[PDB]
Amino acid sequence: MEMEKEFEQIDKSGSWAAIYQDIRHEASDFPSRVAKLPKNKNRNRYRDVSPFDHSRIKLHQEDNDYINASLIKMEEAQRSYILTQGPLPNTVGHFWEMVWEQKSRGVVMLNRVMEKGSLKCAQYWPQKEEKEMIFEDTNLKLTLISEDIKSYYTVRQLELENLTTQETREILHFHYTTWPDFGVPESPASFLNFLFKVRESGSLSPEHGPVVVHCSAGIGRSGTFCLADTCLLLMDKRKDPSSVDIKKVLLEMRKFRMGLIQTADQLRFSYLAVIEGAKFIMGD
Numbered sequence: 001m002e003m004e005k006e007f008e009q010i011d012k013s014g015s016w017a018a019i020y021q022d023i024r025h026e027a028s029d030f031p032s033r034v035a036k037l038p039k040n041k042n043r044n045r046y047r048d049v050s051p052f053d054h055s056r057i058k059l060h061q062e063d064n065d066y067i068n069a070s071l072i073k074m075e076e077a078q079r080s081y082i083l084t085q086g087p088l089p090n091t092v093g094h095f096w097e098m099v100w101e102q103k104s105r106g107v108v109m110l111n112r113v114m115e116k117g118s119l120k121c122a123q124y125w126p127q128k129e130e131k132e133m134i135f136e137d138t139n140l141k142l143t144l145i146s147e148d149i150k151s152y153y154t155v156r157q158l159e160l161e162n163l164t165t166q167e168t169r170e171i172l173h174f175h176y177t178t179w180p181d182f183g184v185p186e187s188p189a190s191f192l193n194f195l196f197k198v199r200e201s202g203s204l205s206p207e208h209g210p211v212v213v214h215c216s217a218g219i220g221r222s223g224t225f226c227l228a229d230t231c232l233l234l235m236d237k238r239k240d241p242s243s244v245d246i247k248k249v250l251l252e253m254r255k256f257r258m259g260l261i262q263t264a265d266q267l268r269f270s271y272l273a274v275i276e277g278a279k280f281i282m283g284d
């Protein structure tokens with residue numbers, strides 16, 4: 001079926017939970033043996049969220065190459081994403097090692113450091129220009145260059161230096177600051193505006209390594225971001241945009257990381273975002 005009318009048909013019939021459970025039943029199951037090794041317990045935020053072995057990002061280190069991060073490679077859309085958990089106190093150096101080694105231009109953050117009164121990820125970037133951060137375990141230096149605070153999101157320019165080679169690179173930090181502690185946003189308008197700002201920066205384009213996107217577990221909000229982006233790109237590429245099937249795209253993405261889209265409310269919100277986004281693209 002088309003999307004917008006499939007949407008109203010699920011609303012009128014109140015069957016979002018059943019649609020979402022079907023997706024959960026059909027989703028791929030691949031091994032995640034490296035994630036479960038005892039030496040990696042303090043590298044995982046949640047025991048039930050792990051990268052598959054076949055798609056995990058490997059650190060360029062011979063001691064321990066593990067990070068909780070996955071490469072989502074979308075062949076028809078010609079887009080790739082790295083989805084990862086919010087960094088932990090003992091993985092902030094690994095996180096920036098990955099950004100460096102994978103040649104990423106941008107980092108997309110969809111959570112606040114504290115939500116619901118608890119810490120959802122480490123404070124992994126510097127908050128003042130004159131107070132830079134050094135990660136001694138991976139030999140990197142990170143400096144805040146500029147910060148632009150808007151009503152729904154903040155964009156930061158960061159300098160990452162590989163202290164071993166003295167090479168430097170400019171990284172863009174896109175921080176969506178207004179996702180509610182509970183539920184999903186009422187309107188997708190600010191989330192779509194944010195997606196378009198990431199796109200306009202070059203961070204999603206083939207001349208760079210894959211964008212790094214995270215929330216707390218790296219599957220819920222993060223899944224919504226890449227699902228909406230890929231669906232909108234396919235609607236622009238194809239002769240028949242009504243042929244884009246958001247459930248089929250989600251199942252393809254779940255071949256590369258488990259659990260993408262965590263609730264039926266996140267599934268409905270993803271539909272809403274793609275539907276509204278397709279009107280603004282055109283041509284309108």
Ligand SMILES: O=C(Nc1ccccc1)N1C[C@H](O)[C@@H]2C[C@H]1CC[C@@H]2O
Binds near residue numbers: 169
């Ligand atoms: O480092 C950059 N881009 C980049 C490329 C690849 C991977 C990660 C980052 N920058 C962008 C552009 O090249 C120059 C240099 C630097 C800083 C800003 C200036 O526009």
